[PDB]
Structures are given as structure tokens and as C-alpha cells.
Design an enzyme around this catalytic site. Structure first.
Site, mmCIF file in Angstrom:
data_model
loop_
_atom_site.group_PDB
_atom_site.id
_atom_site.type_symbol
_atom_site.label_atom_id
_atom_site.label_comp_id
_atom_site.label_asym_id
_atom_site.label_seq_id
_atom_site.Cartn_x
_atom_site.Cartn_y
_atom_site.Cartn_z
ATOM 1 C CG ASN A 212 -1.985 -1.135 1.043
ATOM 2 O OD1 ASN A 212 -2.893 -1.085 0.214
ATOM 3 N ND2 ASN A 212 -1.802 -2.173 1.843
ATOM 4 N NE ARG B 114 3.747 6.930 2.074
ATOM 5 C CZ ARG B 114 2.762 6.190 2.581
ATOM 6 N NH1 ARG B 114 1.695 5.905 1.854
ATOM 7 N NH2 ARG B 114 2.855 5.711 3.812
ATOM 8 N NE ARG C 138 3.838 0.203 3.945
ATOM 9 C CZ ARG C 138 3.075 1.214 4.348
ATOM 10 N NH1 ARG C 138 3.383 1.891 5.437
ATOM 11 N NH2 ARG C 138 2.006 1.557 3.651
ATOM 12 C CE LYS D 115 3.665 -5.385 -5.073
ATOM 13 N NZ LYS D 115 4.258 -4.993 -3.772
ATOM 14 N N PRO E 252 5.537 -11.069 -10.317
ATOM 15 C CG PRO E 252 6.973 -9.456 -9.379
ATOM 16 C CD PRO E 252 6.808 -10.374 -10.570
ATOM 17 C CG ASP F 16 1.442 -4.550 -9.172
ATOM 18 O OD1 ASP F 16 1.395 -5.141 -10.266
ATOM 19 O OD2 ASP F 16 1.751 -3.348 -9.051
ATOM 20 C CG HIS G 109 0.879 -0.766 -11.634
ATOM 21 N ND1 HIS G 109 0.994 0.294 -12.506
ATOM 22 C CD2 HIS G 109 0.813 -0.233 -10.409
ATOM 23 C CE1 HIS G 109 1.015 1.425 -11.818
ATOM 24 N NE2 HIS G 109 0.906 1.129 -10.541
ATOM 25 C CD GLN H 266 -18.128 -20.749 -10.688
ATOM 26 O OE1 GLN H 266 -18.734 -20.418 -9.672
ATOM 27 N NE2 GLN H 266 -18.354 -21.899 -11.303
ATOM 28 C CD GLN I 18 6.599 -7.805 -13.497
ATOM 29 O OE1 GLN I 18 6.074 -6.997 -12.732
ATOM 30 N NE2 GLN I 18 7.900 -8.041 -13.496
ATOM 31 C CG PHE J 69 5.974 -2.620 -12.672
ATOM 32 C CD1 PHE J 69 6.895 -1.678 -12.247
ATOM 33 C CD2 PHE J 69 4.846 -2.831 -11.894
ATOM 34 C CE1 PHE J 69 6.716 -1.000 -11.052
ATOM 35 C CE2 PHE J 69 4.670 -2.154 -10.696
ATOM 36 C CZ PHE J 69 5.607 -1.242 -10.279
HETATM 37 C C1 LIG Z 1 7.962 -1.408 -6.395
HETATM 38 C C2 LIG Z 1 7.468 -2.441 -7.332
HETATM 39 N N1 LIG Z 1 6.276 -3.010 -7.261
HETATM 40 C C3 LIG Z 1 6.225 -3.894 -8.296
HETATM 41 N N2 LIG Z 1 5.216 -4.729 -8.675
HETATM 42 C C4 LIG Z 1 5.352 -5.448 -9.830
HETATM 43 N N3 LIG Z 1 4.337 -6.188 -10.221
HETATM 44 N N4 LIG Z 1 6.471 -5.402 -10.582
HETATM 45 C C5 LIG Z 1 7.529 -4.730 -10.152
HETATM 46 S S1 LIG Z 1 8.937 -4.947 -11.023
HETATM 47 C C6 LIG Z 1 7.414 -3.870 -9.013
HETATM 48 N N5 LIG Z 1 8.189 -2.944 -8.369
#
Ligand SMILES: Cc1nc2[nH]c(N)nc(=S)c2[nH]1
Ligand code: NI
Length: 316
Positions: free
Chosen positions: A140, A145, A195, A240, A257, A259, A261, A278, A306, A310
Site C-alpha cells: 500500500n 514513499r 510495516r 507479490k 509479481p 500487483d 498494475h 468464477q 513483466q 511494469f
Molecule cells: C515497487 C514495485 N512493485 C512492483 N510490482 C510489480 N508487479 N512489478 C515490479 S517490477 C514492481 N516494483
């Protein structure tokens, strides 16, 4: 007292590695969410710490120029051969990104389009400890940051290396330093929030439950799936985070990863939806499924592909 070098200023002190712009764009790799330890202090000049030393890096169209600050009261020399090897391994320059880009492109037209504008995105081979605790700070959070939290954490817990202009450089802390009884409280003071608990707890867990940093070395030679599962036992580490560490520090190029994105990229750009789910939106299962999807399409270096996407999904 001592100043951030540029190539114009003190060209005596720099050394070079033969490296085309097409194998590595510093400006796309060093601040695009891999390492959080690099900043463009002067234009085209990236400064950051690397294994308890400070470096400034810049490049032309076919040369990677670099200079080292030993830190202690030293005879400012050019980078040695061993230090140049250290930087070679760090950028995994043995790997040809040109052949990877074309190999992924041949099965994926979307990648072909993006890769036009985003060349030289490759993976750093990071120290495991530094990558682990940086990625625990990533929940998050945005890059900027994360960068801030990691900087303060290093100033607060890590050994002082050198000062350049108004910037003081500190090495990454050892586990013992993050594991102590006042560490969580100090880390909240530094703005890490929740964290803080995960950092101290994982530091303590690797020491006592896993026997310190040699464990992370074991995971480097262990197969991907094993490493991922073992990482996921740590406080604050899920799929992730575990995949980012696998990709970025444990030599698992196939780690993808998932996430917000790459979930979004998958849907928008690939038209992918979870098939064997589903439930329509994100979930552990669906995310694992999406990771499999990308491995199937791109192959054993899916993680690197990836990273190209990203990195490109940050720059508008
Ligand atoms: C800070 C950071 N968050 C990430 N999440 C994903 N999916 N790829 C990369 S490479 C990444 N870097
Ligand atoms: Ni849809």
C-alpha cells in the site's frame, strides 16, 4: 567537503564498461521500482550505495561510465577490476536483453509495441536482505514513499559510509540491527506505520527460525516454488512481495509479481480474465493463475518481460 562527481568534472576518476543503451537504460531501471537506493543527483548521473560503497553511474549510447567513493579517508582512485565485476554482476550484463526482447516479441505483439519506446529495461541482481525489507515496505505504497522509508531506515540502523553535498549515505542494516526490542518503535517514528512490525518480526524470524542470512542464500539455489513458499512464511510477505524478491534477488527469472498494475495490464492490454475462477476480480488463486498465464506466454524469463511492462506503466 566532498562533492557528487560528474563525468565533465572529474573524468580522471571514472571507468567504463562496454554496454549499449539498448541493453540498459539507467533512467528506466534505477528508479522504476527495483532498487530504491538510486537518485539522479545531477542530470544523467545516478548515485546510490552498492554493497557498502557509493557509486555514481552515467552512460553514453554505447558505454556505461562509473566511479566509486570508498568512503573512508582514501586515495580517490578509479574503480578496480573487482569493483567493475561487481557492477557487471549487478546489471546481469551476461544476459542479452536484445535476444530476450525479440523472443518475447515473437509471441506478443503488445510487447512489441511497448518495447519500441522502452528498451534497456533489465533486472538488477540485488542483495536478498535489502530487497526483502524494501519490499516489505512496498505494501500500500508508491515508489517515492518507499524510497523515503528505506533511506531513513538505513540512516537510522545502517553504518554511515560517506557524505556528498548534503546527502549522507548509509549501508543497509544487518538483521540483528532490525530485530532488537526498540526497533519497531523507532521504525514507526520513521514513518513506516504498520510495516514497522513486519520489518522487526521478519528480521527476528530469519535470525531465530531460519538461522540468519545464509538462509536467503539457500533460497537463491533452491527452486523458485520452494523459495516463494519459504518467503511467504515471513511477517508482511505474501505472493507479490515474495515474487518480487524471487525475481530481483534470488535469480528466479520466471517469477511474475501480480500487483494492481499487472492485474490491470493483463485485463486492459491482454484481455485476460480468470478462467478457472468464477469470482471476477483479484484473489490469491486468480493472481497465481495470472502468473501462470504470463509464464506460459513469455517463458522462463517471464519476470523480466513483466518488468518491462511494469516500468512502462509508470511513465504515463
Ligand atoms: C515497487 C514495485 N512493485 C512492483 N510490482 C510489480 N508487479 N512489478 C515490479 S517490477 C514492481 N516494483
Ligand atoms: Ni473484461
Amino acid at each position: 567537503h566532498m562533492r557528487h562527481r560528474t563525468l565533465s568534472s572529474s573524468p580522471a576518476l571514472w571507468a567504463s564498461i562496454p554496454c549499449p543503451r539498448s541493453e540498459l537504460r539507467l533512467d528506466l531501471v534505477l528508479a522504476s521500482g527495483q532498487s530504491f537506493r538510486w537518485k539522479e543527483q545531477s542530470p544523467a548521473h545516478w548515485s546510490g550505495v552498492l554493497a557498502d560503497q557509493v557509486w555514481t553511474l552515467t552512460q553514453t549510447e554505447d558505454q556505461l561510465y562509473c566511479t566509486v567513493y570508498r568512503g573512508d579517508d582514501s586515495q580517490v582512485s578509479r574503480p578496480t577490476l573487482e569493483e567493475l565485476e561487481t557492477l557487471h554482476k549487478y546489471f546481469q550484463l551476461d544476459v542479452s536483453l536484445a535476444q530476450l526482447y525479440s523472443h518475447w516479441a515473437s509471441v506478443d505483439s503488445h510487447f512489441q509495441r511497448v518495447a519500441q519506446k522502452f528498451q534497456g529495461v533489465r533486472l538488477l541482481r540485488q542483495d536478498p536482505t535489502e530487497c526483502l525489507f524494501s519490499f516489505i515496505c512496498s505494501s500500500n505504497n508508491n515508489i517515492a514513499r518507499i524510497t523515503g522509508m528505506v533511506e531513513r531506515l538505513c540512516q537510522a540502523f545502517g553504518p554511515r559510509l560517506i557524505q556528498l553535498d548534503d546527502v549522507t549515505y548509509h549501508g543497509f542494516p544487518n538483521l540483528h540491527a532490525l530485530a532488537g526490542p526498540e526497533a519497531e518503535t523507532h521504525l514507526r517514528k520513521l514513518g513506516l506505520g504498520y510495516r514497522a512490525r513486519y520489518v522487526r518480526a521478519s528480521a527476528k524470524a530469519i535470525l531465530e527460525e531460519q538461522g540468519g542470512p545464509a538462509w536467503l542464500q539457500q533460497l537463491r539455489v533452491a527452486p523458485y516454488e520452494e523459495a516463494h513458499k519459504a518467503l511467504c512464511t515471513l511477517p508482511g510477505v505474501g505472493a507479490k512481495v515474495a515474487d518480487c524478491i524471487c525475481l530481483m534477488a534470488l535469480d528466479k527469472p520466471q517469477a511474475v509479481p501480480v500487483d494492481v498494475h499487472v492485474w490491470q495490464i493483463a485485463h486492459r492490454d491482454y484481455g485476460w480474465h480468470p478462467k478457472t475462477s468464477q469470482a471476477k476480480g483479484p484473489s490469491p488463486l486468480a493472481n497465481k493463475e495470472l502468473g501462470n498465464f504470463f509464464r506460459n506466454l513469455w517463458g522462463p524469463y517471464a519476470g523480466w518481460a513483466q518488468a518491462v511492462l511494469f516500468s512502462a506503466d509508470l511513465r504515463q
